[PDB]
Amino acid sequence: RFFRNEMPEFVPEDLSGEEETVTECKDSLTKLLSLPYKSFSEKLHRYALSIKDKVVWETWERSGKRVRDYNLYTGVLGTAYLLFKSYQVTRNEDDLKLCLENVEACDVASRDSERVTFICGYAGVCALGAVAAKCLGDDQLYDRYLARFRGIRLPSDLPYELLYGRAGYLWACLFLNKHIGQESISSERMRSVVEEIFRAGRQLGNKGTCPLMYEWHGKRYWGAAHGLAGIMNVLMHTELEPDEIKDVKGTLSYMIQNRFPSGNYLSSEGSKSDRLVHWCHGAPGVALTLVKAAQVYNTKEFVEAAMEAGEVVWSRGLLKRVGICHGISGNTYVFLSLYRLTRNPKYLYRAKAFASFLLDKSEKLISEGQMHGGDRPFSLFEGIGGMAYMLLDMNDPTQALFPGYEL
Numbered sequence: 074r075f076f077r078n079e080m081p082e083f084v085p086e087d088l089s090g091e092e093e094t095v096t097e098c099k100d101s102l103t104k105l106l107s108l109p110y111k112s113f114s115e116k117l118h119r120y121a122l123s124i125k126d127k128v129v130w131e132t133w134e135r136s137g138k139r140v141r142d143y144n145l146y147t148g149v150l151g152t153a154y155l156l157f158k159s160y161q162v163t164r165n166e167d168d169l170k171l172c173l174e175n176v177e178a179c180d181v182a183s184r185d186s187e188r189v190t191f192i193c194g195y196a197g198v199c200a201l202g203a204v205a206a207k208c209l210g211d212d213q214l215y216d217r218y219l220a221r222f223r224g225i226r227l228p229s230d231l232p233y234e235l236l237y238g239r240a241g242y243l244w245a246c247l248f249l250n251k252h253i254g255q256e257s258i259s260s261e262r263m264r265s266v267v268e269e270i271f272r273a274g275r276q277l278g279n280k281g282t283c284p285l286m287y288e289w290h291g292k293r294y295w296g297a298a299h300g301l302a303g304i305m306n307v308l309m310h311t312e313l314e315p316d317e318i319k320d321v322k323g324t325l326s327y328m329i330q331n332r333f334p335s336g337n338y339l340s341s342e343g344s345k346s347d348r349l350v351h352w353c354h355g356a357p358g359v360a361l362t363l364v365k366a367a368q369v370y371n372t373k374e375f376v377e378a379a380m381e382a383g384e385v386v387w388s389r390g391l392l393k394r395v396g397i398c399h400g401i402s403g404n405t406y407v408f409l410s411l412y413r414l415t416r417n418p419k420y421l422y423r424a425k426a427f428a429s430f431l432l433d434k435s436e437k438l439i440s441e442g443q444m445h446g447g448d449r450p451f452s453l454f455e456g457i458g459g460m461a462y463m464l465l466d467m468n469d470p471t472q473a474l475f476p477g478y479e480l
């Protein structure tokens with residue numbers, strides 16, 4: 074379920090060339106939407122600082138700096154990452170320091186952990202640690218997180234998907250390497266994870282239909298978090314061979330040709346219900362993946378499919394939940410992604426409308442239960458942590474990357 078999107082479509086025409094139409098309804102929301110970007114982004118920035126502060130209060134100070142959760146998704150690493158994003162935007166070195174203090178606590182709390190991914194496990198802790206240390210200029214701290222990251226091993230048991238599986242660990246490696254700008258994690262190690270991914274996908278899949286196939290919890294999920302999209306997405310970020318490229322292209326075509334009559338995407342193989350429009354399941358996560366296919370492959374099929382997935386988000390993507398995983402902050406990135414790809418200000422405008430909706434309405438909507446605020450209300454993936462993160466990323470919308478998804 075979604076709020077009906079009755080927000081005004083983007084107007085390309087230069088008006089005013091007045092005169093401001095008198096009978097046109099002008100509330101606080103419409104005034105936000107009309108705002109020129111410079112002051113609109115400054116406004117969202119100030120709001121995001123208050124959210125950020127609130128999140129730091131609750132997850133760090135109130136709790137007396139004690140760490141139970143730890144991971145990016147719902148735990149304290151979500152807070153460190155938000156602090157990191159804030160540092161990236163503001164260059165406030167106190168944000169980076171606090172970041173590192175949160176990481177260190179997460180590290181302590183994550184020994185004994187068997188979680189291996191960026192978003193849900195220990196590779197997330199180590200890769201942020203190492204990147205934050207590099208920014209700070211602390212080489213010894215860097216080596217130390219780098220050694221912990223390099224000690225990670227993958228049970229033959231692991232799944233393939235993003236939250237718990239190999240695409241997830243491999244995502245962390247790509248993230249670490251891109252940011253340091255070095256082969257910090259070994260290219261042979263990353264290539265080996267890739268080959269295991271194609272091996273299993275090819276074994277369970279049929280060259281006739283979907284050339285690559287996976288299962289998590291015995292389910293054949295299509296989406297970003299546990300499905301085909303998230304895996305293909307990660308694979309596009311590495312050096313494929315020609316037949317690997319065909320197989321990734323193939324799996325993505327398969328999904329395009331086989332979506333709902335509404336243009337939304339199935340949660341999992343033969344599902345009979347068109348209901349979810351989330352990053353985790355549905356159009357939003359898949360759109361982000363097609364945008365990436367579009368950038369790498371430059372195919373009409375992918376470009377147009379990405380745009381079409383964007384229309385499903387535009388009409389149904391205004392979820393009654395605030396967050397990144399399955400909410401408005403997370404669906405905003407669909408428009409940001411389309412904007413990065415096309416440079417078409419209509420897509421910026423669409424991200425601007427979802428962000429304005431959240432700033433104008435979210436507090437009121439959450440506090441009277443018409444918007445769900447996340448089970449962990451201050452987490453990165455469920456709570457307002459992710460709204461602050463999205464808000465901060467609007468400051469420089471062409472540099473905005475869905476956290477733990479886009480590289």
Ligand SMILES: [Zn+2]
Pocket residue numbers: 298351352353354398399
């Ligand atoms: Zn979700």
